[PDB]
Structure formats: structure tokens, C-alpha cells
Write a protein that binds this ligand. Sequence first.
Ligand SMILES: NS(=O)(=O)c1ccc(NC(=O)NCCNCc2ccc(F)cc2)cc1
Ligand SMILES: [Zn+2]
Length: 257
Amino acid sequence: DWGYDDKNGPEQWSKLYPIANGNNQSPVDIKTSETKHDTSLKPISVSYNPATAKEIINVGHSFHVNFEDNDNRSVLKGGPFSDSYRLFQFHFHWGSTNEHGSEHTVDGVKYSAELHVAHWNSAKYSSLAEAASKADGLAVIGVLMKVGEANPKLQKVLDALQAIKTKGKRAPFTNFDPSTLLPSSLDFWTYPGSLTHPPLYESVTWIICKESISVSSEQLAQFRSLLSNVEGDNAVPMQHNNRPTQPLKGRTVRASF
Ligand SMILES: NS(=O)(=O)c1ccc(NC(=O)NCCNCc2ccc(F)cc2)cc1
Ligand SMILES: [Zn+2]
């Protein structure tokens, strides 16, 4: 089993998953003086149906909000993509304290948390399971979360956590459009990368928003009060789940702006 402890964490993942030392690993530090503006990048277009929201689940190291993905009711288009990508999940990463928590960094600056909105290429593949290992299979929007004022748009998510406190618990999570969590501007960086935890597939086209969203210190505390243990065991809070940034290995981060 992999995790984020010193024994099973990011620094040891390569033992079980050798791709952890690959050439397209995520997250990365975005150095803005080295980004390349691309005039061929179109605007990001998201159109999500709130009826596709399905379920929230404690997965031990984090929690996931999953969506019905049987059709194109909820899609991401534009940016670097010619294909439509179907929403299937969003989740967060956070750190042990406010000073860190994001996965991507910008000019070395660490933010308090990071939102990931994940999609799969339904123009080319028939399912998430098929798409997840293909180089053009996944598209994930990352939004950096800067500690400050409480973010009211997180409210439904935060209010749901008390029903999935321990590992494996799950509950209906319906009628929610996660485009309400995105920043007002969708100016972005993009680069070819990977899942940020095992199985670390190098299948993700990343879309990192330039604008951050807010989160309060107490809202972050609610994430960290989720438990990684199963019901009845000694409580083990989910203190953190962000991977360190990884070498670019010659990749180009492109800017839409
Ligand atoms: N933090 S993140 O990079 O946004 C991020 C991290 C992890 C995920 N999870 C997945 O992608 N699960 C797909 C796994 N499907 C089973 C499977 C697929 C292929 C295969 F060969 C064997 C089994 C999503 C986003
Ligand atoms: Zn993630």
C-alpha cells in the first residue's frame, strides 16, 4: 500500500511504481519566465450538468466527489484540446499546515491546497478505465487555493464530510455543478504530465488556472479532520496528501495569456 507517510510516501513510490521517476511526472513548479505563450490555445470551456453529481467517498488518503459519466452532460472543451473530455471526479489536496498544501507551485510559491477537476477523453475511448493509461486520456484542471477568506462555494462539500468521516464510507452527493468552484478567469497554463499519486500514469494534460480561489484556515481544518482509518480503529487524521513537485525533464509549460 502507498500513502503519504515517511515509509510509504512520495519519496518511496518508485519502488512499487517505477514511472514515479518518469519524464512526464506531476506536479511541477511553474516558472513564469520560462513559460511559452501559445496563440493557438483556445479558451477553456466547461459545461457541467448538476444532475451528474453522484457520490462522495472517503478513499483513506483523501476524499472524492464522483460524477455519472455515461454521456456528455458534463464536458470540458477548448484549451489545447480538439476532443471533448467528460467530467468524472473532483477532489482536493492539502498540507499539514497552511504554509503548504498545493501540489503545483508557481515561481516556487506553495499555496494552502489545490482543487483538481478530472475528465477523460470520451471522443477516443469508451471508459475511464480505458482512457486512464493513454497519453491523451485524461484532462485535469488544477486551481490553487490561497488561505484567506472563507469560500462559501465549498459549503456543500464541507457539509458532506461528516457522513464520510472514516475510510470507505460513501454517501450520495447530488445536484452540484463544480464549475462554481472555478476562479472567475480561466487563463491557464498547460503541460503534459501525470496522475500525482499511484498509479502515476503519464496520461494527464494539465490545465492550471492562473487565478487562485480562497479557502479559510478553518475550512482547511475540516479537510484535515477527515480520518484515514476505518470505523472503530484508532483515529488517524488525514494531515496531508500533496506530492512534491517533480522535474520538468525538458517539458514546456505553455501559457494561454
Ligand atoms: N491527483 S490527480 O493527478 O488529479 C488524479 C489521481 C488519481 C486519479 N485516479 C484515476 O485516474 N483512476 C483511474 C484508474 N482506473 C483503473 C485502472 C486504469 C488503468 C489500468 F491500467 C488499471 C486500472 C485521478 C486523478
Ligand atoms: Zn489530485
